Write a protein that binds this ligand. Structure first.
Ligand code: HEM
Ligand code: HEM
Ligand SMILES: Cc1cc(N)nc(CCc2cncc(CCCN(C)C)c2)c1
Ligand SMILES: Cc1cc(N)nc(CCc2cncc(CCCN(C)C)c2)c1
Ligand SMILES: C[C@H](O)[C@H](O)[C@H]1CNc2nc(N)[nH]c(=O)c2N1
Ligand SMILES: C[C@H](O)[C@H](O)[C@H]1CNc2nc(N)[nH]c(=O)c2N1
Ligand SMILES: [Zn+2]
Lengths: 407, 411
């Protein structure tokens, strides 16, 4: 019931007690592990509020205080009267930071307590949402010196007045099916692009077209807005050794900003809560550029390198992969846009884990997501046993709104 | 009940029904996943259902389920269990059981080969000397002058747990490791403890960087005995690089035969505590783990120096760059010497086809994503994008305690 995790490189053993506070389910059972699966009322609400408010008041060393009891008292009355309750600014900020702290798939959590929280609970229209998001984007970008941020829109009420950002990330590139049968742009975004066009977006039909925002306020029909082009910082990709690399015409955006997840705090649900940090290079260099279902550039780079592509065992794919990831890091660094390489980031996470075990009794981590998509075992996280479990406040997946929306 | 897995690269969705046959625990609960944890004397009462489950599976596989031959065999085993408290497998059942333990091994990416396994029945073995002879024969057969053949040798099953056969070596072929008084390590740092045991048992250590360890062999619960595998039976490959002529001067080599000898084979409730098995190497096992783990030969720095990479900051990816070259060299070297080896692209591609075939014809394929995905270049192999279900089927290979921690010394 008290669990040990071992690092097989260092022999360091940590003891996890924090897992005994998990509430949400994993998907696994005693008979089957689903560790590699990507997507596995007043009565209900008050214990959730209490559990959260208890952890909040413990965090500021006023557990069992009159102010603690008074708050609990106040929230219980508000739930009985109004069926929901409103978080204090202090609680909203605490909850947001802790949702990130609890994000088991995030390698960047050493940064968790440094999060700028934008309270957008006063927002009422899609135009309001657009303004808030532009300001988030500009703040977080900070001319290349990225700062972590989250913007939090009004909480779900009856579920018929949800605020949603229809985009999965604030900044993504369009994807288009060609008559030629090929795909132009980002293939992962063909469907969403179709929806934008359907809603009246005039698509430029290029390879790196920043998608417009599709914003839904108060359960109303989503509306289209274009992020000011000057607020979208992009980096052209070149290589320090290969002069030809620039000729590939590759670029990527500087701001990684997830916009499709649900923030749960104290049983309240924030269905629109875009958040952003800064990139780890492999995200772009390995996944965005080299996934066969994405920009899929391996072959073209390998040819430019004149590698022997006849046999898998020449490791031409692996060689081209490294160079692509070298180019990504070099380009961001040259343009002074914050980026972290997978060695530095995973080393940070190990230190974070050790801090968390030492001061919190554990750190929920998903090894399948934490280990980088290249060079796994030369990063320290590969050798680190991790326990995965769900704590609240949390960021959760939610259904894509076009399957949900009654137009 | 039906469970679906999806491949996120291809959108191929498979449906698992085989998991309904799973028995042992995973380590996970509804509240915690232990998917990245490495390591998460039977009564007759528990033995017959296990024997019967196995025999039913065996007779189904040969299309004789419910036959008189099937029923007579259940009867025969029941009587043997009630009479002698255990039972003996037929040779056909032993071979079936061993192939299926491999087929069921969720951490093994090489399972497309499972039906092709040479099974050496060593159940008539009685002494450590006898074990040595069987193991030499396995090494020679499996090696086959570089054209490797999968094989397993099966020593007598556990009885009262006080007469266990054990191979104390975790693998049949490994290099010695020596801890120096200055704290540095010579040879393979992973094998320091076991090397010390061997020396204590009387092994004369040459004290070099690549000394093949002797076999330490325990028969019938007796104290283990040392034997040196004939050097001419141990195939090794000097490592060189096709473009970098200095790579040979790193002085690296490795053995051709990967052979696990510390696992327990369970078939029909019987426990085979000494069952060494071997296949052929996937390149990354040597090039990534053996050579580049910080806790092993740890050659990344020296290699990157010789390539004159920028080692001042990690973001030059000098480690990744050197890592690829080392792995090219291992593959090049084995191929040049005509010793069987498979690259991680070939092996994972073959695994995906195996896995799909298993879903179609068997209703599933238990797989541990954490072990299946190679230790370099993960997401440019197809297994990275493949959702897997991990569960445990028998016959199976299991971990067991290291013998030095549990052995009662006779003296
Ligand atoms: C500041 C530097 C940060 C770094 C280096 C970082 C790194 C990463 C990486 C590499 C991933 C995997 C993404 C993928 O493979 O799709 C990830 C996932 C995630 N991150 Fe972080 N992140 C950072 C900031 C943040 C912030 C500010 C938050 C929340 C406020 C956050 C919450 C999450 C969540 C919930 C996931 C899982 C997303 C999903 O399931 O798709 N991260 N992070
Ligand atoms: C024939 C070619 C084979 C290939 C290419 C192959 C490949 C692999 C690889 C790469 C691993 C991971 C090794 C590690 O990281 O320590 C592994 C593990 C494993 N293999 Fe296979 N293997 C082969 C044959 C076999 C055979 C013949 C058996 C048994 C009859 C077997 C059973 C297992 C088991 C039980 C594991 C898990 C070992 C552990 O938990 O330490 N494999 N295999
Ligand atoms: C907060 C945060 C930080 C970070 N380093 N990465 C992310 C991921 C952001 C991201 C941006 N564009 C595109 C994607 C694609 C993700 C699709 N995955 C889920 C298959 C993801 C988020
Ligand atoms: C049957 C089989 C096939 C294969 N390709 N690899 C193996 C593993 C072989 C192997 C050989 N020497 C040493 C090791 C060390 C493994 C260390 N792990 C368990 C921590 C492993 C076994
Ligand atoms: C099937 C498997 O879970 C899937 O491919 C996962 C693996 N690990 C990952 N890890 C990260 N960080 N991001 C991902 O999208 C994935 N994809
Ligand atoms: C902690 C983690 O489970 C451990 O380092 C695992 C990861 N995956 C692995 N995969 C293989 N094939 N072999 C290994 O030894 C490991 N080690
Ligand atoms: Zn699990």
């Amino acid at each position: 019931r008290f669990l040990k995790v071992k690092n097989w490189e260092t022999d360091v053993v940590l003891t996890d007690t924090l897992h005994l506070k998990s509430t949400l389910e994993t998907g696994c059972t005693e008979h089957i592990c689903m560790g590699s699966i990507m997507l596995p009322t007043k009565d209900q609400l008050f214990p959730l509020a209490k559990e959260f408010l208890d952890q909040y008041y413990s965090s500021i060393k006023r557990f069992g205080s009159k102010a603690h009891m008074d708050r609990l008292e106040e929230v219980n009355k508000e739930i009985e009267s109004t069926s929901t309750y409103q978080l204090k600014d202090t609680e909203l900020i605490y909850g947001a930071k802790h949702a990130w702290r609890n994000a088991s798939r995030c390698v960047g959590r050493i940064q968790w307590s440094k999060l700028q929280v934008f309270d957008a609970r006063d927002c009422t229209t899609a135009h309001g949402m657009f303004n808030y998001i532009c300001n988030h984007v500009k703040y977080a970008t900070n001319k290349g010196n990225l700062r972590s941020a989250i913007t939090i829109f009004p909480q779900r009420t009856d579920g018929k007045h949800d605020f949603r950002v229809w985009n999965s990330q604030l900044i993504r590139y369009a994807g288009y099916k060609q008559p030629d049968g090929s795909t132009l742009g980002d293939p992962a975004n063909v469907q969403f692009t179709e929806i934008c066009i359907q809603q009246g977006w005039k698509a430029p039909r290029g390879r790196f077209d920043v998608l417009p925002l599709l914003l839904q306020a108060n359960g109303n029909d989503p509306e289209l807005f274009q992020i000011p082009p000057e607020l979208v910082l992009e980096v052209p990709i070149r290589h320090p050794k290969f002069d030809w690399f620039k000729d590939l015409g590759l670029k990527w955006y500087g701001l990684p900003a997830v916009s499709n997840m649900l923030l749960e705090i104290g049983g309240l649900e924030f269905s629109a809560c875009p958040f952003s940090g800064w990139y780890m290079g492999t995200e772009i260099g390995v996944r965005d550029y080299c996934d066969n279902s994405r920009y899929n550039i391996l072959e073209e780079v390998a040819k430019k390198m004149d590698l022997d592509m006849r046999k898998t065992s020449s490791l031409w794919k692996d060689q081209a992969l490294v160079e692509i990831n070298i180019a990504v890091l070099y380009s961001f660094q040259s343009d002074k846009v914050t980026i972290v390489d997978h060695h530095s980031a995973t080393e940070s996470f190990i230190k974070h884990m050790e801090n968390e075990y030492r001061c919190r009794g554990g750190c929920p981590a998903d090894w399948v997501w934490i280990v980088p998509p290249m060079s796994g075992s030369i990063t320290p996280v590969f050798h680190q046993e991790m326990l995965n479990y769900r704590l609240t406040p949390s960021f959760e997946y939610q259904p894509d709104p076009w399957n949900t929306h009654v137009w």
